[PDB]
Amino acid sequence: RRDWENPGVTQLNRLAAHPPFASWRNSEEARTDRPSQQLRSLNGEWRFAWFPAPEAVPESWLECDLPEADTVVVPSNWQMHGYDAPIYTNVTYPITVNPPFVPTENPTGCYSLTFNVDESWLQEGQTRIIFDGVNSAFHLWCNGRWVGYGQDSRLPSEFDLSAFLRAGENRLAVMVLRWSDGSYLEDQDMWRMSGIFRDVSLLHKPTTQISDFHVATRFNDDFSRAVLEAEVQMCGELRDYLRVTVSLWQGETQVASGTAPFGGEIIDERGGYADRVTLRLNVENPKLWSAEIPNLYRAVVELHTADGTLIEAEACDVGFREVRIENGLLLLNGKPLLIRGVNRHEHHPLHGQVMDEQTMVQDILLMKQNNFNAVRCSHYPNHPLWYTLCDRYGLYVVDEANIETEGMVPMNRLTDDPRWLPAMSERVTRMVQRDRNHPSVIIWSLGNESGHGANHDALYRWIKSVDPSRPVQYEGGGADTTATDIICPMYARVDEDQPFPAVPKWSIKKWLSLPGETRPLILCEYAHAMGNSLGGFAKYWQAFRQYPRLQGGFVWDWVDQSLIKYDENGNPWSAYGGDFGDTPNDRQFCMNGLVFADRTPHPALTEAKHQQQFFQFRLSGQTIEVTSEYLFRHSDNELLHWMVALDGKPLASGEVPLDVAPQGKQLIELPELPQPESAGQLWLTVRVVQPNATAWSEAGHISAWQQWRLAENLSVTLPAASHAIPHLTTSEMDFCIELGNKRWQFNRQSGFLSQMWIGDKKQLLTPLRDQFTRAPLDNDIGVSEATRIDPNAWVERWKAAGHYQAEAALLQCTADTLADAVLITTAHAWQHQGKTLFISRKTYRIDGSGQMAITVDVEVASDTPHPARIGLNCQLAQVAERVNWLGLGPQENYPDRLTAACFDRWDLPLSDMYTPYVFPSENGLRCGTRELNYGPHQWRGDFQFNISRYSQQQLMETSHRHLLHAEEGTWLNIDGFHMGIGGDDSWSPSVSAEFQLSAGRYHYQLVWCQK
Amino acid sequence: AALLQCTADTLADAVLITTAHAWQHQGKTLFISRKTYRIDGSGQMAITVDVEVASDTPHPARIGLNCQLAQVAERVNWLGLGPQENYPDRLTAACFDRWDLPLSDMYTPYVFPSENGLRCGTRELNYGPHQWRGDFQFNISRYSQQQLMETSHRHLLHAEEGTWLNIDGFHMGIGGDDSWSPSVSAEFQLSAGRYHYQLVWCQK
Ligand SMILES: OC[C@H]1O[C@@H](O)[C@H](O)[C@@H](O)[C@H]1O
Ligand SMILES: OC[C@H]1O[C@@H](O)[C@H](O)[C@@H](O)[C@H]1O
Ligand SMILES: [Mg+2]
Ligand SMILES: [Mg+2]
Ligand SMILES: [Mg+2]
Ligand code: NA
Ligand code: NA
Ligand code: NA
Ligand code: NA
């Protein structure tokens, strides 16, 4: 009687969902949130055996352990144990789309556990087992006898084992099916795994117990008073001597407390709930909760007798906060929020989708450290501990039901079918009943990518009836449907409309003012951070700050979903789509994070931190104006740190303490700054510093910064002409310039500098040539594949145009002698099938001081896709340990993603000039560089550059960063101009026009020499 | 305009004059203009300009060259944006083509005299025996920028000897969102710091 193929059966004998319980038998333990004797963990070593289908599971297993089984750790994903491969598919379902049927060959994981139960647990009360997460459906047996069934991989399933357990040894048999009808609602773009991946527990409750409690906090207009309302429901024998006492604790203090017997108010003609009671406590001047200041209280619910005997007690942290959308704005405690959020999948590079406290806290610290204040549980309820952490550390959470069917056609084929209303209903209602008490949860989401069906509207209204305290949102069907309180598009651009039929993505600014529209707009996903991305990120924030109703969004996404594999030698490397024999697979589309699977920041994370600062600065002569973007806190743990520097050389500095009220401003008068003398550019740089360490930050943590170009002094005193003069030698094949020790050679057959010498030492391994292409970035490739080509993607437009295989034809190559320098003039014409794509005219001027002045002037056909770049490149022979440059840094920065970078003198090891993106591509570029120093070399001008041991060619031919091999020497890419990286989304041209090399005619000048 | 350098060299087929000036005011160096004139066998002068602008001096109204020509022709022919006066931030209506008009139509009789008649995106300009080629903007009339800024009414303007030529490699926008406060959009402000344009002067 196949239950995994019937959307009408989502469980069998499963107990009701509810807030986190622990059944303390001591109120003091409850208040202090200390471990509970009535809550045992069944985590550890279990017995596991894999099978090709449930029909292959031998009966013996139900009562007797299979010897063929192995001992494995639980929770875990059997794919991670190597029992079968984890699949990575984006939209296209991993199985054949034929609801509600699943493959006959359904990987079945057989988990078993022998453990014993204290005799005292069976002498009284209720003993139940709790599975926080089983992917994707499963049957449970206790001591050979069958208990129940459950579906929905992201919420806990609980069963009453009281009548199955015996004192002493007991055995659990858990048959977990990888696929099930529930899989139709679990089509998220992530690795497709299975098994018991979340904690297993054993909870003992009294017979007469607390079965549920709801905490609510309502305030007066100025939040000076608040009423805490606690609705409590019980089970078991009802008796008058029964009582419930809800007490509110602020630390060791008891702010309020109320006691009352069961018996609710009259609700209808039949009376009221005799098995419930509501307590209402008053609270004067409550400490409000926010991501800024996570002020919490402790609510302790006690079930006892009138004579004072405790029966059992439950509790939870309470955060006094009011969330409401009013007059088009999302208000948190009366103030309009600006969501600096990010989407976060529960992913571990080694543990699969199994979460642990440590990984969680880590992520949370990183997030807050990079100025994030909100997170979206994309796309399913998260592990229970997570909400607890966000509560205490301070993070606005979007709790999202486990429902995605993006693979269906049309997308709402299931969500609009009343036959599936039941399955969906439970994934929404059970989430609410579980997490509704967490203050960090400020918004409820109905799921992800599932079109817009009636079911969504029905469930939308349910939440609104059940819990008025939180707004509901859903992006399906166009982001502004009748099923959402917030216009929550995903990847809708700032100024550009994407008029798709039925579900267009309007410019977020245009969206707010559409006729009739009045809701607040917060993108549920934006700034696809896939690889070298996040370009144009600053534009979003510029807009968020200017438009009251543009209240932020959630970046996509937090961490790369890469898994660790090992080569023959036993070395670890990051793997993605297909790397497990999984097929069909979606390449590297599972890696869209701001950090690598091991939580190592990507360059882009830094840009995010900067744009999401909570302190804005403006400069007016001598005064720096600091404006606070906080809504509640005062800048009581910050001090401004300034410093003036002439092209890297510091001159003055100081530090003023910050005393800014939320929303307020503070003026800082810098002392008569040092009057520069030497030629150069003076740069004022301010940094906000947190002197004291917090719960999430180290001491001296930097929360914000900003630069300003002070005065400038154009150098007029041109160089003192040296008396030496370069000598020009002429072959029929070469032009050789010699000066003292240095030797220059221009191959008259190419028109390029083929070699240089500093003594009997060669300097180049590859001629110094022009370059107009780049190792395609993920954003340049989009969804274009080997067999399926997307002619629109930048990479394809370039390929087709012939940029990647252009033959450089020589038009001219002459040499002349001047009063004090040799002058080589070149001129090339890159073409493809006749079409002249680029023309590069240059003039090299080597003078007495031994400096080579390269002047380039390029032309680009006004009918050939704009080049990825316009510069020069060559393979240097040396391999130095450091790289020093005066320009934007220290981290990788590109035209459309360089706001965070600062202008100064930077020095780093050659390796840090290379960004280890799992999928290799153009990287490590640094813009606005006036001086570059590598080995004996020094390049001067106003260029961009990237320097590493990998050629653009290798990079574009290599698929994984671990297959990259260092090459002889160091590859230098010096660009006069570089196209933006884009990133508004990674599946369609997303580079803003102002960042496209389209000028037609470009000009840059370089000065090569020996330092 | 202080002279920093002015040298001449001989090449395999052309003379090469290199200049470099530093416009200042009370010590402060406002602009630096490096140029190289290349007159070759075909008798064409190739002027290559490379200007620098102090990143702390109000963005210049323009970046070009000018001189008072001796001739006074009846027509003006150019390949670029026209036929009417057009500026960077107000040239959408103009079309690219070959335009020919009488010298007078290259002057806009605004009652209150000011910079006028500019034409952007010009690749070829023909006046009298002259022809200028490149990718510049220009305005050509019988009134000097100086007279124009010293004169209050268009009827007090007197034609001057010859024809004044203003060839800009870059011209700041005219603005107009309102006429009582800076109204020129940032993208139209000569702020790049370093500019570069090239011209070819010759006889048609
Ligand atoms: O990067 C692709 C993304 O597309 C979004 O629409 C979806 O909600 C995400 O879960 C992910 O699939
Ligand atoms: O989620 C929105 C989009 O995400 C992309 O990754 C996918 O290739 C598209 O087909 C669409 O699903
Ligand atoms: Mg079922
Ligand atoms: Mg998806
Ligand atoms: Mg900025
Ligand atoms: Na806003
Ligand atoms: Na993705
Ligand atoms: Na402070
Ligand atoms: Na005037």
Side-chain angles (χ1 to χ4, degrees):
Chain A
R1 188 161 180 181
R2 322 171 75 63
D3 296 298
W4 58 95
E5 295 199 303
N6 170 29
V9 171
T10 48
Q11 67 72 54
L12 286 166
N13 299 313
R14 188 167 56 182
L15 307 182
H18 56 68
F21 289 161
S23 184
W24 278 289
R25 301 307 167 79
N26 175 203
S27 296
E28 188 52 12
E29 293 300 289
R31 185 186 69 79
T32 65
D33 194 49
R34 291 205 284 268
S36 177
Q37 293 302 303
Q38 299 61 54
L39 179 39
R40 283 155 53 179
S41 177
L42 296 194
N43 289 50
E45 297 190 296
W46 287 48
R47 294 292 292 169
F48 178 78
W50 186 99
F51 286 89
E55 303 89 329
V57 181
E59 130 65 57
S60 59
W61 178 69
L62 288 182
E63 295 168 57
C64 184
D65 186 68
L66 298 183
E68 58 189 72
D70 308 66
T71 291
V72 298
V73 190
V74 181
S76 62
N77 289 118
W78 70 69
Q79 288 63 47
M80 294 306 103
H81 286 344
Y83 290 110
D84 65 20
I87 313 178
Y88 174 55
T89 182
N90 191 329
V91 181
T92 297
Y93 279 107
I95 63 174
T96 298
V97 197
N98 173 43
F101 305 106
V102 295
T104 46
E105 283 178 56
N106 201 313
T108 307
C110 279
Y111 296 79
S112 50
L113 177 79
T114 307
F115 61 108
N116 21 61
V117 181
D118 301 285
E119 174 170 54
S120 63
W121 281 48
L122 307 184
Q123 291 181 191
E124 55 164 52
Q126 181 203 75
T127 304
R128 72 176 81 184
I129 186 175
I130 307 176
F131 291 84
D132 281 315
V134 186
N135 191 326
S136 76
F138 71 103
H139 271 298
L140 173 70
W141 286 270
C142 185
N143 297 325
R145 289 210 306 130
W146 182 80
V147 183
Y149 177 67
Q151 285 182 41
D152 183 353
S153 307
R154 301 292 166 154
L155 283 186
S157 284
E158 294 169 42
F159 307 81
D160 188 328
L161 297 182
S162 297
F164 296 70
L165 298 168
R166 63 164 170 286
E169 282 213 312
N170 277 289
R171 176 148 176 291
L172 294 179
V174 187
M175 185 181 79
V176 175
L177 306 167
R178 181 164 180 170
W179 305 126
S180 58
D181 66 64
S183 296
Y184 281 112
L185 308 187
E186 292 173 42
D187 185 47
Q188 290 85 322
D189 172 42
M190 55 183 196
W191 285 98
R192 316 309 187 103
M193 302 180 187
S194 55
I196 307 184
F197 66 111
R198 280 187 189 168
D199 315 321
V200 180
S201 303
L202 223 61
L203 172 67
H204 182 288
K205 301 270 295 180
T207 273
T208 286
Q209 44 167 275
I210 290 181
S211 59
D212 190 23
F213 65 100
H214 309 307
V215 175
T217 53
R218 300 176 292 83
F219 323 72
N220 51 39
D221 52 14
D222 50 291
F223 300 78
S224 47
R225 287 187 313 197
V227 182
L228 183 152
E229 207 161 295
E231 181 199 298
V232 188
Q233 325 186 193
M234 64 103 261
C235 291
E237 198 70 303
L238 265 178
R239 296 289 171 58
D240 326 71
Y241 63 69
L242 281 184
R243 299 273 186 292
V244 173
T245 296
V246 180
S247 38
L248 190 60
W249 296 79
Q250 163 51 61
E252 297 297 294
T253 307
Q254 197 200 58
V255 299
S257 174
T259 304
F262 282 97
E265 56 286 314
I266 295 177
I267 76 179
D268 62 49
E269 298 89 341
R270 296 295 280 171
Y273 288 87
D275 61 327
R276 296 188 193 173
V277 62
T278 307
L279 289 306
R280 300 191 182 67
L281 307 184
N282 299 304
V283 179
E284 303 297 295
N285 319 299
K287 290 174 169 290
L288 310 190
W289 183 94
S290 65
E292 291 172 55
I293 308 171
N295 289 306
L296 294 180
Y297 284 66
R298 188 68 173 181
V300 176
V301 188
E302 294 157 287
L303 176 53
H304 63 91
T305 53
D307 66 22
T309 308
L310 176 64
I311 290 172
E312 126 173 300
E314 293 292 340
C316 74
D317 303 313
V318 177
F320 289 76
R321 97 251 172 300
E322 187 210 64
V323 182
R324 84 171 193 274
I325 298 179
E326 169 187 290
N327 199 53
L329 294 180
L330 177 56
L331 308 180
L332 189 283
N333 293 327
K335 302 308 199 69
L337 295 180
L338 177 50
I339 301 302
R340 299 170 171 64
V342 64
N343 291 277
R344 172 177 177 286
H345 261 287
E346 304 202 296
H347 179 86
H348 194 291
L350 300 164
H351 300 168
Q353 312 172 328
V354 180
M355 287 298 105
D356 52 291
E357 193 179 311
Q358 219 171 61
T359 296
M360 291 187 201
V361 184
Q362 172 176 50
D363 287 335
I364 295 182
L365 294 194
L366 281 174
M367 286 160 78
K368 296 186 68 67
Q369 279 168 33
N370 286 289
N371 304 325
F372 279 87
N373 62 21
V375 58
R376 183 194 165 198
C377 300
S378 54
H379 292 291
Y380 41 65
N382 273 41
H383 172 302
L385 182 56
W386 181 256
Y387 305 80
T388 293
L389 294 174
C390 292
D391 272 15
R392 305 177 178 171
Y393 274 94
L395 279 184
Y396 299 125
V397 189
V398 173
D399 210 8
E400 188 167 281
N402 185 33
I403 309 175
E404 189 180 324
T405 65
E406 173 177 26
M408 300 299 307
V409 187
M411 202 179 311
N412 77 336
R413 181 170 291 277
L414 296 187
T415 59
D416 186 55
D417 175 358
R419 184 215 181 196
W420 287 77
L421 176 54
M424 290 180 71
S425 164
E426 287 194 56
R427 292 166 179 276
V428 168
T429 54
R430 299 180 82 237
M431 162 182 67
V432 176
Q433 297 218 287
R434 187 192 77 170
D435 311 329
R436 67 177 310 178
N437 284 337
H438 283 286
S440 59
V441 168
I442 66 176
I443 299 175
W444 295 116
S445 171
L446 302 174
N448 190 50
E449 300 175 301
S450 297
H452 175 211
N455 296 354
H456 281 125
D457 291 301
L459 298 178
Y460 163 84
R461 180 59 198 147
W462 182 90
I463 300 178
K464 303 290 289 177
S465 291
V466 178
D467 171 44
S469 87
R470 304 191 183 72
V472 176
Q473 69 162 64
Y474 180 58
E475 173 282 336
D480 53 31
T481 69
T482 53
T484 181
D485 292 307
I486 301 172
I487 297 174
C488 53
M490 57 171 67
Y491 310 106
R493 302 177 180 189
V494 177
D495 308 298
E496 161 185 36
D497 289 4
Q498 302 186 68
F500 299 122
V503 285
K505 293 190 190 304
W506 305 113
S507 142
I508 58 174
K509 299 156 82 171
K510 164 179 176 171
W511 213 320
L512 292 173
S513 62
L514 280 175
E517 188 49 59
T518 55
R519 279 166 297 188
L521 194 167
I522 303 171
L523 300 112
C524 67
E525 293 173 51
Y526 80 114
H528 205 250
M530 170 182 248
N532 193 6
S533 192
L534 228 72
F537 190 73
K539 186 180 300 189
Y540 270 102
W541 287 86
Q542 193 294 290
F544 290 161
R545 294 202 176 70
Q546 171 169 35
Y547 289 56
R549 281 166 59 213
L550 276 188
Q551 287 179 276
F554 296 77
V555 180
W556 182 283
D557 76 305
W558 187 232
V559 59
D560 283 325
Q561 282 186 63
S562 52
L563 299 172
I564 281 298
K565 289 184 69 63
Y566 303 86
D567 62 319
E568 32 283 288
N569 313 312
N571 299 88
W573 54 277
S574 298
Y576 53 69
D579 289 328
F580 292 72
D582 50 303
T583 161
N585 69 68
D586 282 294
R587 302 296 129 181
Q588 66 276 48
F589 264 83
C590 49
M591 301 187 293
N592 311 159
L594 291 176
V595 304
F596 296 100
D598 62 304
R599 276 51 177 183
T600 298
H602 276 205
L605 177 57
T606 195
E607 181 82 339
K609 185 179 176 191
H610 177 55
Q611 283 300 311
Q612 303 178 332
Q613 292 173 176
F614 294 76
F615 289 114
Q616 304 287 296
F617 316 80
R618 281 195 306 175
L619 182 55
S620 186
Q622 282 298 71
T623 303
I624 297 177
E625 182 204 57
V626 187
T627 312
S628 176
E629 294 199 304
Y630 278 113
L631 300 169
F632 315 115
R633 67 182 303 272
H634 201 77
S635 55
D636 59 44
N637 176 36
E638 296 105 325
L639 83 171
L640 182 49
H641 194 304
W642 67 273
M643 173 224 79
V644 175
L646 181 58
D647 295 325
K649 338 172 201 304
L651 304 182
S653 70
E655 59 169 52
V656 188
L658 279 183
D659 191 46
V660 204
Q663 312 282 50
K665 294 188 174 187
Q666 186 191 314
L667 291 178
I668 295 178
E669 182 84 306
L670 290 180
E672 178 187 297
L673 297 178
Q675 195 57 298
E677 49 201 305
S678 175
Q681 184 60 64
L682 272 186
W683 292 77
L684 168 66
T685 305
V686 302
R687 279 191 178 285
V688 166
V689 185
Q690 280 162 32
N692 308 306
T694 70
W696 50 275
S697 69
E698 43 279 352
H701 170 68
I702 304 183
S703 62
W705 70 88
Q706 187 66 287
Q707 271 194 313
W708 284 279
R709 243 194 180 86
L710 286 178
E712 178 173 55
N713 290 312
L714 299 181
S715 177
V716 290
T717 56
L718 292 184
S722 69
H723 296 68
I725 303 177
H727 185 292
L728 169 67
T729 305
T730 303
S731 307
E732 183 207 308
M733 205 55 47
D734 301 70
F735 282 140
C736 306
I737 296 72
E738 299 181 56
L739 183 68
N741 189 297
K742 310 163 187 180
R743 200 121 52 74
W744 288 273
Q745 175 190 169
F746 290 80
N747 186 291
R748 305 181 62 180
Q749 233 271 280
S750 311
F752 305 113
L753 180 66
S754 55
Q755 186 61 273
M756 292 188 271
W757 279 285
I758 297 182
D760 46 352
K761 316 307 175 190
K762 309 186 178 306
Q763 298 302 296
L764 306 174
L765 305 187
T766 310
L768 173 53
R769 314 160 65 86
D770 299 77
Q771 191 178 188
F772 304 110
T773 49
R774 76 177 173 195
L777 307 177
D778 274 304
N779 291 321
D780 295 321
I781 299 168
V783 290
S784 185
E785 270 177 39
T787 74
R788 197 76 186 225
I789 279 62
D790 180 355
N792 193 47
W794 275 106
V795 71
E796 298 302 348
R797 298 212 269 225
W798 291 326
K799 285 164 62 179
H803 297 189
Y804 280 111
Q805 49 178 36
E807 226 76 76
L810 179 52
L811 302 177
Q812 164 194 50
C813 179
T814 73
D816 286 3
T817 307
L818 302 177
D820 58 318
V822 180
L823 191 61
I824 311 299
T825 294
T826 76
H828 304 79
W830 272 270
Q831 326 175 68
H832 179 270
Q833 312 191 326
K835 175 55 181 176
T836 300
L837 305 184
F838 318 104
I839 287 182
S840 169
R841 300 187 179 63
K842 307 178 217 58
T843 63
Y844 308 69
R845 183 162 178 300
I846 311 171
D847 58 56
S849 61
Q851 309 191 68
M852 180 170 64
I854 319 176
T855 284
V856 192
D857 278 290
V858 188
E859 273 197 67
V860 184
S862 72
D863 67 315
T864 191
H866 309 304
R869 48 137 57 77
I870 292 180
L872 308 170
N873 90 301
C874 66
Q875 193 181 188
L876 306 178
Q878 302 91 309
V879 173
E881 284 199 305
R882 311 284 301 181
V883 182
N884 184 294
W885 81 102
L886 185 62
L888 293 176
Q891 301 179 72
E892 163 188 284
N893 56 79
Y894 285 74
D896 63 316
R897 196 199 71 216
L898 51 66
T899 61
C902 295
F903 181 80
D904 212 293
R905 172 78 55 179
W906 310 103
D907 201 307
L908 301 167
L910 178 60
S911 61
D912 295 349
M913 305 303 283
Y914 161 70
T915 310
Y917 291 132
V918 170
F919 171 67
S921 81
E922 151 69 52
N923 72 76
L925 196 67
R926 264 69 165 182
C927 312
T929 302
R930 317 308 293 293
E931 186 198 309
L932 173 53
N933 305 297
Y934 189 55
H937 311 288
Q938 188 195 68
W939 297 267
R940 288 184 294 88
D942 187 38
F943 59 85
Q944 342 304 309
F945 78 92
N946 70 56
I947 184 174
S948 67
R949 304 288 299 296
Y950 313 102
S951 59
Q952 289 294 290
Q953 163 163 49
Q954 176 175 184
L955 289 173
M956 72 174 99
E957 300 181 312
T958 308
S959 49
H960 299 56
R961 65 174 174 178
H962 78 296
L963 305 190
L964 291 175
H965 69 286
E967 296 179 47
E968 276 185 59
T970 315
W971 281 102
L972 179 71
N973 289 296
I974 285 193
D975 301 316
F977 309 82
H978 202 99
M979 186 185 114
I981 60 170
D984 281 311
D985 74 63
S986 303
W987 43 94
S988 78
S990 49
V991 173
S992 198
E994 69 271 26
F995 288 99
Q996 284 170 47
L997 304 183
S998 60
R1001 274 165 289 296
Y1002 290 77
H1003 169 101
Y1004 56 112
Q1005 28 202 63
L1006 283 170
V1007 167
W1008 199 329
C1009 72
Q1010 172 185 49
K1011 61 203 298 287
Chain B
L3 179 52
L4 302 176
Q5 165 194 50
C6 180
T7 73
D9 285 3
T10 307
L11 301 177
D13 58 318
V15 179
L16 191 60
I17 310 299
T18 293
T19 76
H21 304 78
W23 272 269
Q24 326 175 68
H25 179 270
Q26 312 191 326
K28 175 55 182 176
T29 300
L30 306 184
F31 318 104
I32 287 183
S33 170
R34 299 187 179 63
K35 306 178 217 58
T36 63
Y37 308 70
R38 183 162 178 301
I39 311 171
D40 57 57
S42 62
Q44 309 190 68
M45 180 171 63
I47 319 177
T48 284
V49 193
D50 278 291
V51 188
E52 273 197 67
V53 185
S55 72
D56 65 317
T57 191
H59 309 304
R62 48 135 57 76
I63 291 180
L65 307 170
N66 89 300
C67 64
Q68 192 181 188
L69 306 178
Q71 302 91 308
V72 173
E74 284 198 307
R75 311 284 301 181
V76 183
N77 183 295
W78 80 102
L79 185 62
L81 293 177
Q84 302 179 72
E85 162 188 283
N86 57 79
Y87 285 73
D89 63 315
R90 197 199 71 215
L91 50 66
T92 62
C95 294
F96 182 79
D97 211 293
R98 172 77 56 179
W99 309 104
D100 201 307
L101 301 166
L103 179 60
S104 60
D105 296 348
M106 305 304 281
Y107 160 71
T108 310
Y110 291 131
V111 170
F112 170 67
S114 83
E115 152 68 51
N116 72 77
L118 197 67
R119 264 68 165 182
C120 312
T122 302
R123 317 308 293 293
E124 186 198 309
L125 174 54
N126 305 297
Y127 189 55
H130 311 288
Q131 188 195 68
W132 297 267
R133 288 185 294 88
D135 187 39
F136 59 86
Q137 343 303 309
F138 78 91
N139 69 57
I140 185 174
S141 69
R142 304 288 299 296
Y143 313 102
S144 58
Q145 289 294 290
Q146 163 163 50
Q147 176 175 183
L148 288 173
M149 73 171 100
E150 300 182 312
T151 309
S152 51
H153 299 56
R154 65 174 176 178
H155 77 296
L156 305 189
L157 292 175
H158 68 287
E160 296 179 47
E161 275 186 60
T163 315
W164 281 103
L165 179 71
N166 289 296
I167 284 192
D168 301 315
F170 309 81
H171 202 98
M172 187 186 115
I174 61 170
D177 283 311
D178 73 63
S179 304
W180 43 94
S181 79
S183 51
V184 173
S185 198
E187 69 272 26
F188 287 99
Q189 284 169 48
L190 304 183
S191 61
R194 275 166 289 296
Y195 290 77
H196 169 100
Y197 56 112
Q198 29 202 61
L199 283 170
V200 167
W201 199 329
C202 73
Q203 173 185 48
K204 61 203 298 287

